[PDB]
Amino acid sequence: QFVCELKELAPVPALLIRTQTTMSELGSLFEAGYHDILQLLAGQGKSPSGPPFARYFGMSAGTFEVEFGFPVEGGVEGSGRVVTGLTPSGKAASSLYIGPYGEIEAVYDALMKWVDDNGFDLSGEAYEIYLDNPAETAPDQLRTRVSLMLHES
Numbered sequence: 001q002f003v004c005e006l007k008e009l010a011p012v013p014a015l016l017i018r019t020q021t022t023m024s025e026l027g028s029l030f031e032a033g034y035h036d037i038l039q040l041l042a043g044q045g046k047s048p049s050g051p052p053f054a055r056y057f058g059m060s061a062g063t064f065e066v067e068f069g070f071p072v073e074g075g076v077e078g079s080g081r082v083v084t085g086l087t088p089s090g091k092a093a094s095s096l097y098i099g100p101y102g103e104i105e106a107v108y109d110a111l112m113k114w115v116d117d118n119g120f121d122l123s124g125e126a127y128e129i130y131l132d133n134p135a136e137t138a139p140d141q142l143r144t145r146v147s148l149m150l151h152e153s
Contacts, residue, residue: 002107004095004114007147011089012050015040016069017081023060030054030068033081037069040082049073055088057125088127093120094147100139104146111148123149 017033034052041047050071058064071087078084093115097107108126115122129145 002095002097002110004093004111006118006120006150007092007094009088009090009092009147011086012071013074013076014069014071014085014087015048015076015078015082016067016085018065018067018083018085019081020058020063021066022063026066029066033068034070036080037082040079041070041072041076044076046072046076050087051129051131053087053127053129055125055127088147088149090123091120091150091152092127092147093118093150094145097144097146098140099142101134101142101144104144107146108148111146115148115150121151121153123151125149 015037017036019029021029038048048070052068052070054066054068056064056066067085069082069085076084093111095107095111095114097104112122125148127147127149129147131143131145132141134142
C-alpha cells in the first residue's frame with residue numbers, strides 16, 4: 001500500500017536548528033524554532049525556498065538528535081540558534097505518506113521492509129518533509145515525504 005523508492009538526494013542550502021531533545025519537548029521546540037527561522041528570513045526580506053523538514057537520529061525513548069528547518073535560496077545568514085547548512089545528501093529509501101501524522105509508523109514499517117529486501121543498511125536517521133501544514137490541511141490529505149537514510153556497505 002506504500003510505494004517505496006531508492007533516491008539520491010542532492011543537497012541545497014538550508015537554515016536550521018540542530019539540537020538534542022526528548023519527546024515531551026519536541027512540540028514546543030518545533031513551534032518556536034520554525035517561527036525563529038521564518039522571522040529571521042522575513043527580517044532579511046526573504047522567505048524559504050522549499051517545504052519545512054526535520055531529520056531524526058536516536059531513540060524516541062530518550063534524548064535524540066533533531067535537525068530541522070527550511071531550504072533557502074542561500075546568501076541568507078544565521079543568527080542565534082539558527083545556522084546555515086544543507087538539506088540531506090546521499091542515498092535514502094523514500095515514500096510519500098498521506099494521512100494524520102500520528103499513524104505514520106505504517107510507512108516506516110514498509111520502508112524498513114523495503115530496505116531489507118534491497119540489500120541496503122539503515123544509517124539510523126529519518127528525514128521527513130512536511131509538504132502540507134496540519135493547521136490548514138485535513139488529516140486525510142496531509143502529505144509527509146518520509147525517507148530513511150542509507151549506508152553503503
